Amino acid sequence: SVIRWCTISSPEEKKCNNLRDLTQQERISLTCVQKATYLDCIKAIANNEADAISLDGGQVFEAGLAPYKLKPIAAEVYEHTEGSTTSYYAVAVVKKGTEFTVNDLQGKTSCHTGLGRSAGWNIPIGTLIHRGAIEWEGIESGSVEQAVAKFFSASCVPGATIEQKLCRQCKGDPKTKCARNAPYSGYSGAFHCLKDGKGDVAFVKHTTVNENAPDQKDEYELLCLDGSRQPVDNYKTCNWARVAAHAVVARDDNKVEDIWSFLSKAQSDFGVDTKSDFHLFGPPGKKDPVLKDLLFKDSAIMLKRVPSLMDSQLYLGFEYYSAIQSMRKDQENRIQWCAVGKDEKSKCDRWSVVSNGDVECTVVDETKDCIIKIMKGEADAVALDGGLVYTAGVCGLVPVMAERYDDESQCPASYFAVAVARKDSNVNWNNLKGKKSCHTAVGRTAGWVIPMGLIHNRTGTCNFDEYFSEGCAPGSPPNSRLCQLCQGSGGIPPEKCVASSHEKYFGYTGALRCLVEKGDVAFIQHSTVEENTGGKNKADWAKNLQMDDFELLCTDGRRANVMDYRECNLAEVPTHAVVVRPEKANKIRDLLERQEKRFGVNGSEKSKFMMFESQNKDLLFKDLTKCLFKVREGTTYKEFLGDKFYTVISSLKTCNPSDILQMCSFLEGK
Ligand SMILES: [Al+3]
Ligand SMILES: [Al+3]
């Protein structure tokens, strides 16, 4: 196995070949391919001519677009007091004593790392446009380069292809001084452009001055957004943005592992603390800027694997991604709801019709897809079980409206997680090992987090697939034993163990059925037996079920009547809630509030549609819901869930965090 690395300059090619020589005997070898620009590299990689290249976030964006669709597999790590993470700070450095502020940039000369790059372009230009300093309303007001050439008197923007003015301050030969790999390119080139007097300001990163003139830091200052000027070491409190680290992108195929193994071993051997003559990263320090940031930035102290569920859009984040897109586009009162499965989509489509369109619908196969869609902005909201509200929270979404189950006029609030078993049996909370279990779904409060967290806490084990002989816990690996009792849709394809209403044993009611049809214990909520007895459920399996046919399993090992859940429950837990992106909270609460007035349990038009009712399947909202109560603005997911639940799920997630949780933890720095 050989990794074909794509370089975009002769110096990079030289370093790459140097690394090739140093790893010729390794299990995974290295090959070097030099191209004219990073874009030729993106194309080469997509075309299976090369395998990887490290890119600035602005280029990670380009590489992730169709038809390339490359993905970030490794991210640079930079030193941080708070803790080295995979992000850096874009700063605007000027020479001390020049007095002008961020508000006086019009008419000044500027130095940039390169066109389309985070710190050197996307951040500074996007910011000046946002503040209105650079007049640009969108694509129809002309190109961004034209608006920038009109703003700054002259600049050096490696890679600029429309405005000659943006190359005017660049150093070098007439035909190549404006190339993306020219003398004044990169964070270090842009800095020297400033140092040489060719720019009044250089848009670089927080380590730049230290990398090029540590002993002369005192001759520079940072331009803060509030108009102030501060010392270069104050970047944490005087920066224009915190942006995702440069990352190695590659095709979304099997070769990603070998690419990572090569890097992992390469950095173990020539990492930041290596005594070797060869440094994978830099090392940082004074030297010809043309020799800096080769292959990887000199400021990187390590590479970190990027969770597989990550794509370029998620990697960059909604705000930055949206900023880039806005500079490529021109020139609301409807909620884009996320429905999991065909059943939820049908109820949602119906809601769309009676809401006259105030609510729109998007379908996905799994709940986790809703979290991803909302993170990207493709969808606006979704109701999630507390367990998922946690994951959604780690992902940056917040709970804005929550379900209440007691009285509709009551909109604290909660429900109880219980263990249900057949009345006539010895099954108890202490002899559960080796038994058949039924779970609403993995990751959910009552069906998984509470029961399993309780077992993990007391036992210390994480191997849950072997604790129960077998059972059904939707969302588990298809061939796992916790999927053996699941039934799928009964159609084709089977869709067995899928975490949606398509799975016969999915949800609170689904797990009860599984108990009646195949299990020894069901992990549901306090009202589940109630909701499906007394003929309230006309399904063949439950049309004749009786409340007294079941019993609750208390933690002490004893058993009780299903109506004494308050004295025999695994835990009292936070209710399900509607999560959204913070900026959307305002609109979603308002639109959701007007909807409940028309279609709530006492809706003025409840005869047309009822938000809180479904065929015993908790579609979109729990069937138990009596009303939604507003979650105070600014409430974090931890505050909403309560410290008790938070502590439980926090610990349990150390066992086997899902792909999405790992992905969002990465985004959070973990
Ligand atoms: Al950068
Ligand atoms: Al629940």
mmCIF file of C-alpha atoms and ligand atoms in Angstrom, residues 56 88 117-118 187 246 297, ligand 1:
data_model
loop_
_atom_site.group_PDB
_atom_site.id
_atom_site.type_symbol
_atom_site.label_atom_id
_atom_site.label_comp_id
_atom_site.label_asym_id
_atom_site.label_seq_id
_atom_site.Cartn_x
_atom_site.Cartn_y
_atom_site.Cartn_z
ATOM 1 C CA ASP A 56 -7.192 25.320 4.439
ATOM 2 C CA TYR A 88 -7.218 28.481 15.011
ATOM 3 C CA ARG A 117 -8.611 30.871 2.331
ATOM 4 C CA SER A 118 -10.067 31.210 5.837
ATOM 5 C CA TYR A 187 0.388 33.135 6.594
ATOM 6 C CA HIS A 246 -6.541 22.781 7.976
ATOM 7 C CA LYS A 297 1.335 24.088 8.724
HETATM 8 AL AL AL B 1 -5.855 28.676 7.081
#
